[PDB]
Amino acid sequence: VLSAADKTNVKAAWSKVGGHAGEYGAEALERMFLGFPTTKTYFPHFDLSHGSAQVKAHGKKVGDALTLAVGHLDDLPGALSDLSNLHAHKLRVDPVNFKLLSHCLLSTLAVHLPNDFTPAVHASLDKFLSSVSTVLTSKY
């Protein structure tokens, strides 16, 4: 998200994603906990077990946070300025952790949508995922 051609790939690419957002939301998280273990300390209150209705019931929360932003490309600071006060104010999440989620979520999409995850779109998504990351780490 930013440039036109980019805001065009994101809405298009995400329609590809469609109603599998929370599933994917789930998986990305699952891939970041195992892959990048430190991230797991931000969730002491969590069933970090593979199958966890909790890790499973947050990916759907993350998926929707992301579907919304997709529909709010022209203004991200405002449409997430709660998630912004959440990750940055109440939780103190490190700006290097967002890349780990951005990497995982992308590694995932590549797993469920091989033909659609092309270079041009992969470019765009990386950008969209950088922008959203910024907004949330904006209160720093």
Partner: protein, 146 residues
């Protein structure tokens, strides 16, 4: 690096299905399309304009293959990375002057292309592993940057 027999066996069995040309030209290509600033180092290789030119460029493919072969040597010298890349490191810092972080980048790009190529069999379990390998090769390629 430091991991597990069942993980190693896994990592290895996957590496016998890796077409090094395909997955090779794919990593380097995306690196260039997704992180355009790295177009600066490979500057001779003709036309690297739109992603269509990058991807179907014979010199991206041929260097890609040289990159992934170097990766395998590493997937097979599990315990001696530093030694393995104790030269690709010197040629990267001195002659090339390439930032350490650009490595981790090409790495995560290599994990993503494995991801699309091997679908569901590229389990969070198995990527869990690859991050370690990509982590180790990165640390080794920058080892000589002091």
């Amino acid at each position: 690096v430091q991991l597990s027999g069942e993980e190693k066996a896994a990592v290895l069995a996957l590496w016998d299905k890796v077409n090094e040309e395909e997955v090779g030209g794919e990593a380097l290509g995306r690196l260039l399309v997704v992180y355009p600033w790295t177009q600066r180092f490979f500057d001779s290789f003709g036309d690297l304009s739109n992603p269509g030119a990058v991807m179907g460029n014979p010199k991206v493919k041929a260097h890609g293959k040289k990159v992934l072969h170097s990766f395998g040597e590493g997937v097979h010298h599990l315990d001696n990375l530093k030694g393995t890349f104790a030269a690709l490191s010197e040629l990267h810092c001195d002659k090339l002057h390439v930032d350490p972080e650009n490595f981790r980048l090409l790495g995560n790009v290599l994990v993503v292309v494995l991801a699309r190529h091997f679908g569901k069999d590229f389990t969070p379990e198995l990527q869990a592993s690859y991050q370690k390998v990509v982590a180790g090769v990165a640390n080794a390629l920058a080892h000589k940057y002091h």
